[PDB]
Specification:
It comes from Ruminiclostridium cellulolyticum (strain ATCC 35319 / DSM 5812 / JCM 6584 / H10) (Clostridium cellulolyticum). By secondary structure, the chain is α+β, with helices and mostly antiparallel strands. It is built from 12 helices and 10 strands.
Length: 307
């Protein structure tokens, strides 16, 4: 499907909804996001420990939508019967519902396409868009994976009432609400993001990530490298989104944005190779991460100068 990518499953679902329903500003605020996080506690619990944002909800993106556009994303929690009744009403009125689902029950990505034949289903929350409630069946779009599927009502209900690695899903649905959308300049959005990135020293979290990778030399458990691989797609997407904005709005950028994208893509390839035991190279991966940390710090400083 030709769905909006965003930079994570949440921003993908919000932007796809905004595109289909003509909600102003959402897409611009997503495409201009610039963020990095690292959580050492989540690393050792093999939770989603790095990338653009702590998930599944990007609460920083929510703050940006509220502050810049007067858009609130309201979380609805109800019992099973009420949640499906509310879905039917939302589909009748709007034709789409943003729902939090356990990816365990979804079929959005074929790892066999990357020669990975042994990937287990895990209980991880994932954002999707419900489009239809049929007879003992629902239709969902997974905009992040450009995928749609038909699911049994029993599987849909299980997926929405599941204990996951990131917490308990309880039929959570997400309403994009505005009393009145307010308009922002793309440079204002980027300046605020790059200034925040430097003030919170988000590049320092890249360094921390690299330092923790170096320490996994003697760790026989390589699951962290698969988790890291998936987590860092959000950073690749933010870099691609900034390149897209540069073209759409004729922006001045530092000249190494494509090179930074390429360095993140290389870190992902090295993590994936290490996960599948094609290498024994934690030091090399740590070094690439710590090098990109310095490059990203310099890049953010240069964006504020040239934008």
């Amino acid at each position: 499907l030709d769905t909006f990518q965003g930079y994570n499953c949440y921003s993908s679902a919000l932007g796809e909804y905004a595109k289909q329903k003509n909600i102003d500003q959402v897409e611009n605020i997503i495409l201009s996001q610039w963020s990095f996080f690292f959580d050492e506690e989540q690393f050792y619990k093999n939770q989603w420990y790095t990338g653009a944002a702590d998930g599944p909800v990007d609460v920083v993106l929510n703050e940006d939508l509220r502050n810049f556009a007067n858009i609130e994303v309201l979380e609805h929690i109800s019992s099973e019967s009420q949640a499906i009744d509310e879905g039917r009403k939302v589909l009748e009125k709007h034709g789409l519902q943003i729902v939090l689902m356990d990816f365990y029950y979804m079929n959005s990505f074929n790892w066999k396409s990357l020669s990975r034949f042994n990937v287990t289903r895990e209980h991880d929350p994932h954002f999707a868009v419900l489009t239809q409630i049929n007879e003992n069946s629902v239709h969902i779009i997974d905009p992040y994976y450009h995928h749609e599927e038909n699911m049994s009502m029993e599987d849909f209900i299980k997926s929405r009432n599941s204990m996951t690695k990131q917490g308990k899903i309880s039929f959570n649905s997400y309403e994009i609400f505005s009393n009145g959308t307010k308009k922002s300049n793309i440079k204002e959005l980027l300046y605020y993001r790059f200034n925040r990135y430097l003030q919170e020293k988000m590049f320092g979290k890249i360094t921390q990530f690299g330092q923790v990778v170096k320490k996994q030399l003697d760790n026989k458990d390589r699951k962290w490298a698969f988790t890291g691989y998936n987590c860092l797609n959000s950073v690749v997407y933010q870099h691609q989104n900034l390149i897209n904005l540069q073209k759409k709005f004729s922006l001045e950028m530092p000249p190494n944005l494509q090179e930074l994208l390429d360095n993140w893509a290389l870190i992902r390839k090295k993590l994936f190779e290490y996960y599948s035991r094609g290498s024994y190279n934690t030091e090399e991966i740590s070094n690439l991460i710590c090098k990109v940390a310095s490059s990203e710090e310099q890049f953010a400083q240069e964006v504020l100068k040239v934008l």
